[PDB]
């Protein structure tokens, strides 16, 4: 579900006119936001002002800096690592989303436009072929774990 | 400032023209042709927009277009020639449907597409421009040529294709460059003999890759670069990266049939002994610090790795030249291994790891981690929450029923408004040899519809083959066969009791809410509903609802539905103060699933249900033995086989939870008890 | 001297599979059809048959058929076959010596 | 035509796969077919395909057959291409006019429609006179406003032709108002329909402030038609597949349908309209019949009110008369008595009389030039200026007349006040090209007044800001979670908290909207005519290129003209208006054969 | 860069040089897929003939022509002297087994490259041009430069160390050199040239002091071994440092 | 456990950068040729590549034309444009373009300059005011402290007599087709284009080269003037026009050398 849900917050930054998409990203377990902030969000209108506007900014890094450091950003600013981190079983959802981010970092630097890596992204979304690199990684190792 | 290998000016125009001369050579697959059309050249030469590349998709993707450009094609590759599924077919669909709706039936067995019908038809007049394009080339670089003839074929191509923009000046200066200097340094020898297209394509294939790794050295910036650029150069910082074993050094197999390998002198250039040089030309060419670093442990498995053979010997005169002052006199070996571990840092997997956070020698500075590593954050609270709603005064029963088709579904994208949108499915690259899924539903509901009214199937056969959606030959005629033999089976049960009836209207007052509405098809013996589908609890609660809203105005009789494999959901008529009660409660459930996240699961929900219902002394049982084989069901039914996709695997459900815990699985077991309990009260 | 190295063949087999099952079933008749359709529903059926003979060497098949015998020799012969016992049945009817 | 004779590929693609290897006359009747529908003529006469083709004698001579195949109609039924309307074949052959399946389809759907099922609904007459009387305040002289809701209301069909100005919605609000009044305990389902999201917003907001003055009852303010839908939405079509939710199986519920801007819908969209309906409702066009042809390939509400000039019946003279309790005139002879009793033309307006030369030019329109010529020179009516336009110094006087024209608009912004009158002082001018791009277009002209207010000190612009205080945007696609619609004009200022665009919303209010949600933004201090339409403004100015293009004919002038409030400025030479005036916009259909029979 | 500055020196030094050579790399490959198939009769190609002949559609015979215009490059660049023996008509003894079907295919292309219009030169016989007219000439050619600086190791291959030699007779040749030991620690051929060595000394730039390549001179002949190979101490300047060997020896 | 992040106290790299001079900021006739960055770069390699001592064959222009893809109708105007050019003499002296020699020319010399110094305009654009006379108007641009190296490609060094000399081609020349190209017209135009500071850079670093490369030197001995060449300026008749010659006052080389210095 990693896979997809950075896939709507791609295509939120890339096209964020249109609403829809920046609330069906916006309401993901990513970010980890409830039904009450969700329903404030979408009647406060200088909140989701501010919003489209930090996510113009997100865009502007995405089309200036590139990949890493937006989502950087992204997870420094609405400081969802650390509520990962925090929440019983994020962990490896934490390292499935920054094996993601390496991933498009490294497929994102070979390609020049910037919706190819959203098309390349949604492409290895529906081919589940299992290549050397993009498998599942280990979650922790400092804390012991039953190995199956 | 990353002295790095030379990005090319326009990757996609070069591999698109790689393409154009792999045109004979190709199959001619709809997404090879859609990547050409991905570039914004060729589609700025035909006067293709993006949201005309962007209906083209759906227009291929619906159409049938999976291969082949001519039926001349599919001949030339040693393969039967079927007809249907070709661009040409596809394109004397689309001009059909631009010409003739698709009610009216086949012109020559080729059902027209009523999509394409207006002025944006005149997209597919732009694609059929480039086809022809696609097949002139395809009989132009088919057979070989010499070399005095191949002048004009890339610029008479490069006009063909590509439109000269502002940005792609320099990819098409740098084709023909290459091309002329191709034929030039051919020609130069005087060859007489006949070229073919392959070894012309595979030599620009590899003069187009031949970008050179940058040497530039700018003296602002911390120059990233690599090991040969500055050999000597006294720095005072030196850092060596990816220092494990079998990337560097590296080592070249040498042909097999050159005289030098067999007999080396002084003045020979191998890779191996440079490597090994310039590692010890970094070693001296550092003045105050030298930092090696290597990928010592495998992120995937946890394995070991080993370092390469310079850093292994490096840390072995180290280890056997230097001691440290703790130990002065314990021994060699261990004197080594103290110096060699305590040399070799260690560092963390993750950066949110605790351990590169504690002061002292190693300390990072990455304060966006910090908070993290420090677990000092909220953790994710729960997504369900009681939401103010005021359930207001007209509320339509379409909203009942797209309500109770699916509750969470609608609690998302109807409440809070947010619909997780699903990309589509990719074109496959070959016919359907077998009908599965949504196509052989909508064949069923087809054959469904026309034999409800005792219409001529094979003319709807004729209709079906005519636009490509059955297999080709003797099994098409099979599947729609066993397909007519299923639905005749149905029919003379659905129509055995079958009545003609019309829509009426719906005006009910419960619970001071209006429900406005129609209802199709309402004969007087009841309701009347046929699905091609199997034996669910969705559409036995949409049953219910159905009867719920016609037995409340009138309407004396039973509700059937008739779904495959003799399934049948029946309810008897009630009385109105039942029905009203019973639609007060379903009124009761809308207006709760839409403050909270109503947990009613109707698959395994109803499964669960079945298990523990007893319908002879209408009761719930209590023993362990039903309360185990109760769970072994909604295990089932939640969570499906390796053929089944089950209803865990749904978006909707796995933002609320990821593991479905016991708590949880009560929560939705109470509430299925408390909603779909009529379902199995009434069944018959 | 200079070759591409592909790590799934899987499309590869898939699409010669494809072009077998194209050269070969299309031009059967109904009679013939009928019976390739109870063996295997497509081609991907036979593909999940026979994948683990494709890859690697290839096995020895035990009584192979000959070369010049096709589909539809194979098909009347099995015709004549149930024929013969139909032709057996039909003459032999209409008694019952058995105790 | 120019555009004619250069072939498009999509017309040569179709003749190549329809006919093949048939004759090349089919071949030739086939491209011909494609690009004429390309155009957005519906039939083609065989006439023009024998006279007007240099390649008939060659066709002539390729076939051979022992009739000789001399007429066009035997060598197109000899092909399997073109049946007489049995066999599925892509061209239908008729009438001796060629057209496509679809299209032959939806003609005779529309035939059908206006020539069968339109029935007479039989009302009392006393209490409808009695609601005439009642509503229509007017009753000394022959009021056409009356004679209108009469035959709407008697008829099931009806067609409504009036131009802008001429009180519309007034009629259809008293309209409303008497069907409510006469069926008082059966219930009136009314709705309104709409080619537009921006029309379907006036019409709304329009028919709520005619309504609410009206004086009703509490059931009958319960009956008030709730909002305005597009026939998109209406009918429920499918942005990925054309399937309709209201097709052919289940019609819409409702009693009766209001469509206003008839000129706009196309022949399929009027055919998926009419295949909608059930057996009981009752249909309302609005439309003006001089007005500017739909967006797509047809022309319905032209070729319907094509036998306007006609006149009424004889018995249908002495019906209006007993209803309107007038004089009504009739019609000289009788042709299609249901299409000439459906019909009616509104000539008195209300908001300009003979006084005004915006009248009497729209009048003019319609007739010869020399009439818009007489109209133009004697006095000028104080009401429409006319400045020729073909070198760099009239370019830049039409400049320095567009200064004023927008005077009150950069006094408004330079005095930093409220963005309500900032909008409503950008509402009364406005400037109305034809082409897009080069030097006479929507991006020429949009671009040359940014380099003019660069010039000279009235707007300041940053070259890499794009948004600057004081440019006016317009939306081109349509959203409803913001609630604008394509057509809408914005302009963008710093009310404090940043740089926003305010939009002023038909229901009274003004919305500031971030930039960056926008979802289209072009600039619009020049609008083309095509999307001009539905709105209204103050002062008006027409800049017509000097090129020749077929673009700028009789309805393009006629919408200029009629777009106008008071003020009319023409920005155009001789030539150019003398050749558009006769130059008529004529689009072939068989309706006017179908009709005759 | 190195070769740019001895293409520099061959049009400085020789007139009537044409700007491109005719034994380029792709030239040569489009020559030899010419001259291959000529050959196929010889005795000498029986190897290529069951490589070639079996099955093709010009792609193996395209790629054997660049792998062979390649050896012939890399031989043109580090060999002179084998294609000039090979340009007479003899074999070299000592090679390796594939050789037979490389002299008469590089003989072949000579008398190719002499038939056609394409000029005689190339890499190697330019080389041994320049150095014969650096050798024999007396006075100093016009549009050579004073002083020339060689910054590091690999800013000259060791290959054009005679053409330096012979630019040293006229031009001054600063060669700043790149050593990471200050000693001698090279290798050796003879004991006869372990004397001739040993009578060379460094005297000081700035202070003029002469000092000895070797740390003891006595014990210079018991630390080289009798093959030629000197036991250096250190080991990671005798296992990483064998291109430095090459060069300072 | 306990744990903070450490801050970082002093920055890690001052604002060094190597930077150039850009960093800091009938039918047929010359008149009605194409404005553009690549024409006035194809006219800088056609005046790099031609020898000014051979005469200019038509032939040669015609494959120069057909190399760089320009129109084949402009190559007889071309020529006679470029031997009207080269025939103009562009001295106070009188002293042509043909009578360099090949040993006399320096044809595009890059230099890097050093600066250890933050260079703050304010303090540097009152020094460039107190001596040259240009900067009347032209108020000053802003750029930021460059400490580090500053590019430079002059287009040629010549020496004469004695006397060496700096010359440069500006051939952009857009607004003017009459011959209103007059002395005043190209102040104008390097008070403009803001050419002064990059004309004064040239001068200090020749006044570096001629001290470095020749010893007892002398800036007024050696130094001769600088010379800027308006392509699309110069005219048959008006010698004056297209050339632009002006010399320092040999005061702020010194002072410029001592603020680059430290």
Redesign the interface.
């Known amino acids: 579900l990693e896979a997809q849900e950075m896939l709507w917050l791609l295509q939120a930054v890339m096209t964020p006119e249109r609403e829809n998409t920046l609330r069906s990203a916006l309401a993901t377990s990513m970010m980890g936001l409830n039904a009450l902030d969700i329903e404030t969000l979408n009647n406060d209108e200088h909140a989701w002002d501010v919003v489209v506007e930090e996510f113009d900014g997100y865009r502007q890094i995405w089309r200036k800096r590139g990949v890493m450091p937006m989502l950087r950003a992204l997870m420094s600013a609405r400081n969802i690592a650390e509520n990962l981190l925090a929440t019983a079983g994020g962990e490896r959802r934490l390292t499935d989303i920054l094996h993601i981010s390496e991933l498009l970092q490294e497929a994102g630097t070979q390609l020049e436009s910037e919706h190819a890596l959203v098309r390349w992204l949604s492409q290895h979304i529906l081919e589940p072929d299992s290549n050397a690199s993009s498998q599942q990684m280990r979650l922790e190792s400092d804390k012991h774990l039953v190995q199956i | 400032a990353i002295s790095d290998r030379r990005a090319r000016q326009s990757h996609p125009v070069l591999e698109a023209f790689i393409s154009l001369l792999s045109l004979p050579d190709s199959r001619f697959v709809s997404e090879d042709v859609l990547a050409l059309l991905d570039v914004p050249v060729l589609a700025a030469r035909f006067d293709i927009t993006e949201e005309g590349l962007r209906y083209l998709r759906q227009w291929v993707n619906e159409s049938g277009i999976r291969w082949g450009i001519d039926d001349d094609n599919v001949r030339e590759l040693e393969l039967p020639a079927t007809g249907q599924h070709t661009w040409r077919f596809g394109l004397t669909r689309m001009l059909l449907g631009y010409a003739m709706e698709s009610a009216q039936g086949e012109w020559q067995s080729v059902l027209p597409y009523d999509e394409s019908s207006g002025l944006i038809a005149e997209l597919v007049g732009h694609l059929a421009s480039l086809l022809m394009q696609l097949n002139i080339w395809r009989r132009g670089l088919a057979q070989e040529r010499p070399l005095e003839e191949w002048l004009p074929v890339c610029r008479d191509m490069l006009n063909a294709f590509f439109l000269p923009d502002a940005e792609t000046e320099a990819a098409m200066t740098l084709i023909e460059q290459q091309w002329q200097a191709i034929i030039a340094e051919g020609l130069g020898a005087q060859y007489g003999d006949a070229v073919p297209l392959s070894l012309l394509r595979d030599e620009l294939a590899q003069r187009l890759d031949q970008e050179r790794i940058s040497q530039r050295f700018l003296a602002g910036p911390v120059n990233i670069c690599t090991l040969m650029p500055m050999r000597s150069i006294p720095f005072k910082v030196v850092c060596l990266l990816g220092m494990n074993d079998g990337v560097y050094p590296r080592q070249l197999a040498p042909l097999g049939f050159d005289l030098m390998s067999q007999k080396p002198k002084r003045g020979d250039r191998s890779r191996r002994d440079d490597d090994r040089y310039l590692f010890l030309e970094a070693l001296i060419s550092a003045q105050q610090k030298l930092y090696i670093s290597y990928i010592g442990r495998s992120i995937q498995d946890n394995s070991e790795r080993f370092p390469s053979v310079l850093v292994q010997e490096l840390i072995d005169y180290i280890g056997q030249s230097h001691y440290l002052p703790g130990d002065e006199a314990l021994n060699c070996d261990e004197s080594e291994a103290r110096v060699k571990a305590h040399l070799t840092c260690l560092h963390t997997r993750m950066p949110f790891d605790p351990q590169n956070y504690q002061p002292g020698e190693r300390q990072s500075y990455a304060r966006e981690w910090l908070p993290a590593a420090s677990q000092a954050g909220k953790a994710h609270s729960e997504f369900v929450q009681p939401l103010p709603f005021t359930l207001p005064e007209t509320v339509p029963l379409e909203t009942l029923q797209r309500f109770w088709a699916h509750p969470v579904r609608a609690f998302f994208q109807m409440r809070l408004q947010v619909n997780f949108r699903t990309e589509d499915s990719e074109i496959p690259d070959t016919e359907p040899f077998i009908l599965e899924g949504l196509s052989r539903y909508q064949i069923n509901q087809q054959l469904l519809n026309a034999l409800v009214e005792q219409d001529d199937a094979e003319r709807l056969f004729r209709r079906f083959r005519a636009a490509g959606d059955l297999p080709y030959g003797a099994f098409g005629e099979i599947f729609w066969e066993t397909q007519c033999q299923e639905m005749q089976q149905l029919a003379d049960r659905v129509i055995a009791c079958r009545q003609p009836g019309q829509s009426m209207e719906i005006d009910l007052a419960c619970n001071g809410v209006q429900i406005t509405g129609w209802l199709p098809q309402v004969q007087p013996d009841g309701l009347l509903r046929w699905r091609p589908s199997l034996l669910s609890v969705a559409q036995g609660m949409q049953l219910w609802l159905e009867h719920l809203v016609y037995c409340a105005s009138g309407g004396n009789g039973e509700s059937r539905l008739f779904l495959r494999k003799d399934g049948e959901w029946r309810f008897p008529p009630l009385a109105a103060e039942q029905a009203l009660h019973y639609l007060s409660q379903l009124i009761e459930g809308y207006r709760e699933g839409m403050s909270a996240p109503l947990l009613v699961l109707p698959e395994s929900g109803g499964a669960w249900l079945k298990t523990c219902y007893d319908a002879q002394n209408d009761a719930m049982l209590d023993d362990d033995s039903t309360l185990q084989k109760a769970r072994t069901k909604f295990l089932q039914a939640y969570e499906g086989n390796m053929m089944v996709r089950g209803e865990g695997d749904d978006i909707w459900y796995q933002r609320l939870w990821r593991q479905l815990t016991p708590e949880t699985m009560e929560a939705i077991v109470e509430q299925s008890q408390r909603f779909l309990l009529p379902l199995f009260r009434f069944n018959q | 001297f200079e070759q591409q190295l592909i790590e799934d063949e899987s499309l590869l087999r898939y699409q010669a599979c494809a072009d077998f099952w194209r050269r070969h079933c299309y031009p059967l008749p109904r009679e013939i059809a009928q019976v390739v359709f109870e063996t295997w529903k497509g081609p991907q059926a036979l593909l999940r048959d026979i994948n683990r003979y494709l890859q690697g060497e290839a096995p020895v098949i035990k009584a192979p058929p000959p070369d010049d015998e096709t589909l539809a020799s194979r098909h009347a012969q099995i015709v004549a076959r149930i024929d013969t016992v139909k032709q057996q049945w039909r003459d032999a009817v209409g008694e019952l010596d058995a105790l | 035509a120019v555009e004619h004779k250069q072939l498009r590929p999509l017309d040569v693609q179709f003749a190549l796969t329809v006919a093949g290897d048939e004759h090349p006359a089919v071949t030739l009747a086939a491209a011909l077919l494609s690009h004429d529908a390309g155009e957005g003529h519906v039939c083609l006469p065989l006439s023009r395909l024998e006279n007007n083709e240099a390649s008939h004698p060659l066709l002539a001579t390729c076939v051979s057959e022992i009739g000789e195949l001399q007429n066009w109609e035997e060598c197109l039924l000899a092909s399997q291409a073109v049946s007489r309307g049995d066999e599925p074949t892509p061209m239908i052959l008729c009438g001796d006019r060629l057209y496509l399946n679809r299209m032959w389809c939806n003609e005779r759907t529309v035939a059908r429609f206006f020539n069968e099922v339109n029935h007479a609904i039989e009302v009392d007459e006393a209490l409808l006179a009695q609601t005439l009387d009642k509503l229509f305040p007017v009753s000394d002289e022959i009021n056409w406003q009356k004679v209108a809701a009469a035959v709407a209301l008697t008829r099931r069909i009806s067609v409504i032709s009036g131009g802008p100005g001429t009180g519309k919605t007034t009629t259809v609000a008293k309209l409303l108002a008497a069907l409510i009044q006469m069926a008082d305990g059966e219930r009136c389902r009314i709705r309104l329909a709409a080619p537009t999201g921006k029309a379907a917003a006036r019409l709304t907001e329009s028919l709520g402030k005619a309504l609410r003055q009206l004086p009703l009852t509490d059931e009958q303010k319960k009956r008030i038609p709730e909002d305005a839908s597009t026939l998109h939405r209406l009918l429920g079509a499918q942005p990925g597949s054309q399937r309709l939710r209201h097709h052919a199986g289940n019609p819409l519920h409702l009693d009766v349908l209001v469509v206003d801007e008839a000129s706009m819908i196309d022949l399929p969209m009027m055919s998926r309209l009419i295949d909608a309906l059930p057996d009981h409702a009752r249909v309302i066009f609005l439309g003006d019949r001089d007005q500017l042809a739909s967006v797509e390939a047809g022309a319905v509400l032209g070729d319907i009110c094509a036998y306007a000039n006609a006149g009424f019946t004889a018995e249908r003279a002495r019906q209006l008369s007993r209803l309107t309790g007038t004089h009504v005139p009739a019609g000289t002879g009788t042709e299609a008595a249901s299409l000439r009793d459906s019909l009616c033309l509104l000539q008195k307006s209300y908001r300009f009389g003979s006084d005004s030369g915006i009248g009497q030019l729209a009048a003019a329109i319609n007739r010869g030039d020399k009439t818009a010529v007489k109209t133009v020179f004697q006095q000028d009516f104080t009401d429409i200026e006319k400045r020729l336009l073909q070198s760099g110094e009239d370019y830049i006087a039409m400049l320095e007349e567009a200064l004023a024209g927008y005077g009150r608009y950069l006094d408004l912004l330079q005095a930093r006040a409220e963005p309500d009158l900032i909008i409503q002082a950008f509402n009364e001018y406005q400037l109305l090209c034809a082409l897009r791009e080069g030097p006479f277009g929507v991006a020429g002209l949009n671009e040359r007044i940014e380099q003019f207010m660069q010039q000279k000190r009235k707007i300041h612009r940053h070259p890499h800001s794009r948004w600057y205080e004081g440019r006016p945007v317009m939306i081109a696609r349509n959203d409803s979670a913001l609630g604008l619609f394509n057509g809408d004009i914005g302009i963008a200022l710093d009310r404090g908290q940043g740089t926003r665009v305010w939009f002023a919303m038909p229901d009274g209010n003004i919305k500031s909207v971030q930039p960056s949600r926008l979802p289209e933004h072009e600039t619009t201090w020049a609008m083309t005519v095509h999307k001009s339409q539905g709105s209204e403004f103050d002062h008006a100015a027409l800049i017509l290129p000097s090129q020749r293009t077929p673009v700028v004919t009789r309805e393009l002038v006629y919408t200029a003209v009629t777009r106008a409030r008071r003020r009319l400025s023409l920005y155009a030479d001789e030539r150019i208006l003398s050749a558009a005036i006769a130059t008529r916009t004529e689009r072939r259909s068989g309706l006017a054969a179908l009709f005759s029979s | 860069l190195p070769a740019s500055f001895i293409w520099d020196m061959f049009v400085r030094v020789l007139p009537e040089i044409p700007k491109e050579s005719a034994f380029n790399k792709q030239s040569m490959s489009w020559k030899l897929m010419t001259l291959l198939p000529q050959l196929l009769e010889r005795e000498d190609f029986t190897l290529l003939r069951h490589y070639l002949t079996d099955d093709s559609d010009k792609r193996k015979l395209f790629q054997l022509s660049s792998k062979a215009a390649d050896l012939f490059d890399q031989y043109l660049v580090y060999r002179p002297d084998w294609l000039a023996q090979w340009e007479t008509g003899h074999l070299v003894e000592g090679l390796g087994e594939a050789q037979a079907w490389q002299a008469p295919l590089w003989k072949a292309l000579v008398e190719y490259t002499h038939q056609l219009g394409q000029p005689r030169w190339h890499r190697a016989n330019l080389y041994q041009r320049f150095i014969e007219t650096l050798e024999s000439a007396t006075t100093c050619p016009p549009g050579l430069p004073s002083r020339v600086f060689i910054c590091g190791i690999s800013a000259l291959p060791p290959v054009y160390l005679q053409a330096l030699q012979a630019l040293g007779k006229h031009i001054e040749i600063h060669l700043l050199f790149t050593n990471p030991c200050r000693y001698y620690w090279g290798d050796i051929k003879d004991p006869a040239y372990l004397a001739k060595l040993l009578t060379r000394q460094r005297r000081h730039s700035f202070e003029d002091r002469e000092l000895p390549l070797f740390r003891d001179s006595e014990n210079a002949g018991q630390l080289f071994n009798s093959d030629g190979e000197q036991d250096v101490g250190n080991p990671l300047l005798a296992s990483w440092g064998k291109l430095g060997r090459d060069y300072i020896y | 456990?306990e744990?903070?992040?450490?801050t970082?106290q002093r920055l890690p790299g001052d604002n060094?950068?190597?930077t150039s001079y850009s960093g800091l900021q009938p039918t047929l006739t010359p008149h009605q040729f194409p404005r553009g960055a690549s024409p006035g770069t194809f006219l800088h390699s056609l005046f790099e590549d031609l020898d000014f001592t051979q005469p200019v064959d038509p032939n040669w222009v015609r494959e120069k034309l057909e190399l760089g893809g320009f129109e084949s109708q402009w190559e007889p105007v071309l020529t006679e444009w470029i031997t009207a050019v080269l025939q103009a003499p562009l001295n106070e002296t009188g002293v042509s373009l043909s009578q360099l020699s090949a040993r006399n020319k320096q044809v595009e010399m890059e230099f890097y300059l050093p600066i250890s110094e933050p260079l703050i305009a304010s303090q540097l654009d009152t020094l460039i005011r107190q001596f040259d006379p240009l900067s009347a108007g032209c108020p000053p641009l802003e750029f930021m402290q460059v400490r580090?190296?500053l590019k430079g490609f002059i287009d040629l060094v010549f020496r004469h007599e004695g006397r060496y000399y700096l010359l440069a081609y500006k051939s952009n020349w857009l607004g003017e087709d009459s011959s209103a190209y007059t002395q005043q017209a190209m102040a104008a135009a390097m008070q403009a284009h803001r050419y002064d500071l990059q004309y004064q850079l040239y001068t200090l670093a020749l006044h570096r080269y001629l001290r470095h490369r020749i010893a007892d030197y002398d800036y007024e001995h050696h130094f001769g003037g600088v010379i800027y060449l308006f392509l699309r300026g110069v005219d048959k008749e008006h010698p004056q026009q297209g050339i632009y010659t002006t010399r320092p006052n040999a005061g702020l080389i010194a002072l410029m050398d001592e603020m680059f210095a430290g």
């Open positions: 456990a744990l903070n992040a450490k970082l060094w950068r190597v580090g190296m």
